[PDB]
Write an enzyme that holds these catalytic residues in place. Structure first.
Site, PDB file in Angstrom:
ATOM      1  N   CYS A   1       1.904  -0.327  13.307  1.00  0.00           N
ATOM      2  CA  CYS A   1       1.405   0.145  14.598  1.00  0.00           C
ATOM      3  C   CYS A   1       2.434   0.106  15.729  1.00  0.00           C
ATOM      4  O   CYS A   1       2.131   0.540  16.821  1.00  0.00           O
ATOM      5  CB  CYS A   1       0.158  -0.632  15.031  1.00  0.00           C
ATOM      6  SG  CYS A   1      -1.141  -0.678  13.795  1.00  0.00           S
TER       7      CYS A   1
ATOM      8  N   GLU B   1       1.678   5.793  10.173  1.00  0.00           N
ATOM      9  CA  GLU B   1       1.626   5.075   8.899  1.00  0.00           C
ATOM     10  C   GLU B   1       0.712   5.809   7.913  1.00  0.00           C
ATOM     11  O   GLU B   1       0.280   5.229   6.907  1.00  0.00           O
ATOM     12  CB  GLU B   1       1.272   3.602   9.079  1.00  0.00           C
ATOM     13  CG  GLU B   1      -0.036   3.340   9.812  1.00  0.00           C
ATOM     14  CD  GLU B   1      -0.051   1.943  10.423  1.00  0.00           C
ATOM     15  OE1 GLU B   1       0.413   1.769  11.566  1.00  0.00           O
ATOM     16  OE2 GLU B   1      -0.523   1.032   9.753  1.00  0.00           O
TER      17      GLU B   1
ATOM     18  N   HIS C   1      -1.901  -3.203  22.008  1.00  0.00           N
ATOM     19  CA  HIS C   1      -2.340  -2.730  20.719  1.00  0.00           C
ATOM     20  C   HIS C   1      -3.679  -3.419  20.454  1.00  0.00           C
ATOM     21  O   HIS C   1      -3.769  -4.631  20.574  1.00  0.00           O
ATOM     22  CB  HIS C   1      -1.347  -3.081  19.600  1.00  0.00           C
ATOM     23  CG  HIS C   1      -1.877  -2.745  18.257  1.00  0.00           C
ATOM     24  ND1 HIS C   1      -2.347  -1.493  17.970  1.00  0.00           N
ATOM     25  CD2 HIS C   1      -2.134  -3.505  17.166  1.00  0.00           C
ATOM     26  CE1 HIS C   1      -2.833  -1.472  16.749  1.00  0.00           C
ATOM     27  NE2 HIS C   1      -2.716  -2.678  16.238  1.00  0.00           N
TER      28      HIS C   1
END
Ligand SMILES: *P(=O)(O)OCC(C)(C)[C@@H](O)C(=O)NCCC(=O)NCCS
Lengths: 410, 79
Positions: free
Chosen positions: A113, A81, A241
């Site tokens: 993500c 990103e 994550h």
């Protein structure tokens, strides 16, 4: 069919800031960031970018390959990103500097993500398709947080820099994928976004609630597909994550309360056993966006017990949003290979920034903002940082000349 | 259940999460953030209230409130 991660390598930056220094500098008690399980964040220098991070993450993989095996890499997916162009993939620079074959598909993948997981799944499916038996894929999740001196102020403590490279093939020496054991869930939500370069906007509270919703629903989808799976019994470890460790502790607690009706002490013991090992390296780099789950996997392998084969459950989330729960197995042999990479030693050898250096770094970062046409980097910005990099076979960003990025091995 | 009954339940779990507020008067205009409740615990309070009320809807439907009074309004509107 056998498939998964043949090799995994990490680059956790050249420098880091201890968050206790940030807390002191803004009159906060130390307990705020310790409370949230945050320790250090990696910080990209002006002479680094997501390409240089990516190449440094992948270089150990490529160095080990035979010429024949290097030539078998026929797809490079960069997951990010932190892109540097609206059309040009970072994969092109990565291919150039790693010396990869010209007979190679190259592209860049975006979904906040979730990008890394999406790339890994595409690579898995290349191998499973058996369109090109013997071909390998290289998937590199790379992200930096180049804050300029805000919309991003909510994210300063948590936003790191890092890259994780995965070689994917039909000989998964590190992580053997559970094929077809996938659940995924997503919907449009404005939890966080990056509508301007070198920046991030959003409502972190909404983002946490959305993460929790996805953690539940992606896992439910997996459970629907994998009959008899149990959230405690089927997974020796869980990697997530990890925007910051405290919220992963909260997510795991929510899952255990709902799925297992577990009591608070039992949940905390389960957290330490199954989830804390994955947080160790995450605490040293901060949120590295699409690479964070892969770093958590590497952390689980190094810091957990693999004296017998173990199954790891993986949860990916990306704002905006999309998510996936998936799984695989690591053997004692795989863990031994992973240990040889020396991730803990690499992270310990980074330059520890003063708050004065960090503030200067932020100020100096505007010279390499998105859209920069020409810049020539001063490697001696911080002489002491350079002394840590020079002689290690690191790629750095030397210059941009008419939008063309030039890199150097130093 | 009403707006005022829900506000009481929000106050209970708030005090349960932040014991230092046990003997503190909490007003509808107070915000969990300004009370010193951290990011994880603000979500925890929402989830405890959801569970107390057997409200099995997406957690994001309780987002966006700027104080506990507004949070109470959000819950009341859902049942
Ligand atoms: P909270 O007020 O305790 O704040 C948490 C924190 C200071 C880490 C803060 O910097 C933050 O919210 N950062 C994370 C932003 C983010 O990536 N959230 C994702 C939730 S899925």
């Amino acid at each position: 069919q056998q498939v998964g991660i043949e090799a995994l390598s990490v680059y956790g930056g050249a420098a880091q800031l201890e968050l206790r220094k940030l807390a002191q500098a803004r009159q906060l008690d130390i307990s705020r960031f310790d409370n949230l399980m945050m320790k250090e964040k990696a910080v990209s220098l002006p002479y680094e970018d997501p390409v240089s991070y990516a190449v440094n993450a992948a270089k150990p993989i490529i160095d080990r390959l035979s010429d024949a095996d290097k030539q078998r890499i026929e797809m490079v997916i960069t997951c990010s990103e932190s892109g540097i162009d609206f059309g040009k993939s970072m994969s092109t620079y990565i291919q150039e500097y790693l010396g990869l074959s010209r007979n190679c598909r190259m592209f860049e993948l975006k979904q906040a993500c979730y990008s890394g997981t999406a790339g890994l799944q595409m690579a898995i499916n290349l191998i499973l398709s058996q369109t090109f038996p013997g071909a390998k894929a290289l998937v590199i999740a790379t992200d930096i947080s180049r804050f300029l001196v805000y919309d991003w102020s909510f994210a300063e403590p948590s936003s790191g820099a890092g890259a994780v490279a995965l070689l994917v093939s039909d000989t998964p020496h590190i992580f053997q994928i559970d094929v077809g054991c996938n659940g995924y869930y997503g919907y449009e939500v404005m939890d966080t976004c990056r509508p301007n370069p070198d920046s991030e906007a959003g409502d972190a509270d909404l983002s946490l609630l959305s993460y929790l919703d996805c953690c539940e629903n992606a896992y439910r989808h997996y459970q629907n597909r994998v009959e008899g799976v149990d959230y405690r019994e089927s997974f020796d470890y869980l990697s997530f994550h990890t925007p910051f460790g405290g919220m992963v502790k909260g997510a795991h607690r929510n899952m255990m309360r709902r799925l297992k009706r577990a009591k608070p002490a039992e949940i905390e013991a389960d957290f330490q056993r199954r989830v804390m090992p994955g947080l160790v390296y995450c605490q040293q780099v901060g949120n590295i966006m699409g690479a964070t789950l892969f770093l958590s996997l590497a952390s689980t392998i190094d810091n957990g017990d693999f004296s017998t084969p173990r199954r790891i459950g993986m949860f990916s989330y990306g704002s905006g949003c999309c998510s996936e729960f998936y799984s695989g197995v690591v053997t004692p042999e795989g863990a031994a290979i992973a240990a040889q990479q020396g991730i803990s030693a690499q992270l310990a050898d980074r330059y520890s920034l003063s708050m004065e250096e960090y503030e200067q770094l932020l100020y100096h970062s505007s010279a390499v903002a998105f859209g920069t046409r020409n810049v020539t980097l001063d490697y001696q910005l911080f002489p002491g940082v350079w002394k840590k990099i020079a002689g290690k076979g690191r790629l750095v960003l030397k210059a941009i000349k008419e939008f063309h990025r030039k890199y150097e091995w130093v | 259940m009403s707006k005022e009954q829900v506000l009481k339940i929000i106050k209970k779990y708030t005090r349960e999460i932040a014991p230092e507020l046990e003997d503190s008067p909490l007003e509808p205009t107070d915000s969990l953030k300004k009370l010193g409740i951290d990011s994880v615990n603000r979500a925890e309070i929402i989830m405890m209230v959801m569970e107390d009320l057997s409200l099995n809807i997406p957690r994001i439907e309780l987002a966006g409130a700027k104080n506990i009074g507004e949070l109470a309004d959000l819950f009341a509107a859902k049942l």
